Write a protein that binds this ligand. Structure first.
Ligand SMILES: Nc1ncnc2c1ncn2[C@@H]1O[C@H](COP(=O)(O)OP(=O)(O)OP(=O)(O)O)[C@@H](O)[C@H]1O
Ligand SMILES: O=C(O)c1cc(-c2cccc(Br)c2)nc2c(F)cccc12
Ligand SMILES: [Mg+2]
Length: 265
């Protein structure tokens, strides 16, 4: 843990907010190294009963080493808060990039999907499933490279564990919203949802209510606007399969002709 304390850092501006994570820019006083401190309130973690998720986030993320996965350097705590020491992502979230641009072109989409597929291939090689691949958890590095972050819902495959109860269902596959046993194929479904949202500007199963969203996901009810190309329609339709066993391997996504034709690499 390298015996860190709050007094070793100078805190800066807020970088973002999560349900539990309050994230700030920070500088280690001696080295001047810039990082991010994810601050969590012990009383709120205890009330919600999410201590096990925090333990998994720290245990899983601290051991991953990949350029498209955000590093977790360490942690410390005081009487009321837990502090996670994270690699700072200077270009913000893919969530904000999408609000600004409205929709991404095919080259930007394919490049993000490749980076996501490479990070997930590394995770899956260790049987680590992320399960919370959503644009607010995809951060951007100094070279504009995508970094997977927020490992709070991560687990070792297979799992029957529930995630959110009232939160966004938009990125979750049918087997997760139904409470069934699931594995690595959960991240392949989220990849298809992201590919669709990047090109269209909204996720495929979006609805005004929780029940209607649930209905659309369980029945896999989505249509493409006219501007979506054949190659993108083909990849998205292969990823958004109700049967998880029918979803492609990550190597099949990385070699898909629409991906190799449009990724910047
Ligand atoms: N290292 C970072 N660099 C820059 N911004 C960050 C960083 N980590 C998080 N953020 C910003 O803070 C927001 C909240 O962080 P995070 O996703 O880790 O919290 P959370 O959603 O509350 O966590 P959890 O789902 O584990 O309970 C992110 O969506 C992003 O906007
Ligand atoms: O009772 C506590 O002090 C407490 C500690 C921690 C904790 C300590 C070291 C590393 C990590 Br990760 C977490 N977490 C708590 C929590 F999540 C809720 C309530 C109390 C604690
Ligand atoms: Mg988050």
């Amino acid at each position: 843990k390298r015996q860190w304390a709050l007094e070793d850092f100078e805190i800066g501006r807020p970088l973002g907010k999560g349900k539990f994570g309050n994230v700030y820019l920070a500088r280690e006083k001696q080295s001047k190294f810039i990082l991010a401190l994810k601050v969590l309130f012990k009383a709120q973690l205890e009330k919600a009963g999410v201590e096990h998720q925090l333990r998994r986030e720290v245990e899983i993320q601290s051991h991953l080493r990949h350029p498209n996965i955000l590093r977790l350097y360490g942690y410390f705590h005081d009487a009321t808060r837990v502090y996670l020491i994270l690699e700072y992502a200077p270009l913000g979230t893919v969530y904000r990039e999408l609000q600004k641009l409205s929709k991404f072109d095919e080259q930007r989409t394919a490049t993000y999907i490749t980076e996501l597929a490479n990070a997930l291939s590394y995770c899956h090689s260790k049987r680590v499933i992320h399960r919370d691949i959503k644009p607010e958890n995809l951060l951007l590095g100094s070279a504009g490279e995508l970094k997977i972050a927020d490992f709070g819902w991560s687990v070792h495959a297979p799992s029957s564990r529930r995630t959110t109860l009232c939160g966004t269902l938009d990125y979750l596959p049918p087997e997760m919203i139904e409470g069934r046993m699931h594995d690595e194929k959960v991240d392949l479904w989220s990849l298809g949802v992201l590919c669709y949202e990047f090109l269209v500007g909204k996720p495929p199963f979006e609805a005004n209510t929780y029940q209607e969203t649930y209905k659309r996901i369980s029945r896999v009810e989505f249509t493409f606007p006219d501007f979506v190309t054949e190659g993108a329609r083909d990849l998205i339709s292969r990823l958004l399969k109700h049967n998880p066993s029918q979803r492609p391997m990550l190597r099949e996504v990385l070699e898909h002709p629409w991906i190799t034709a449009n990724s910047s690499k």
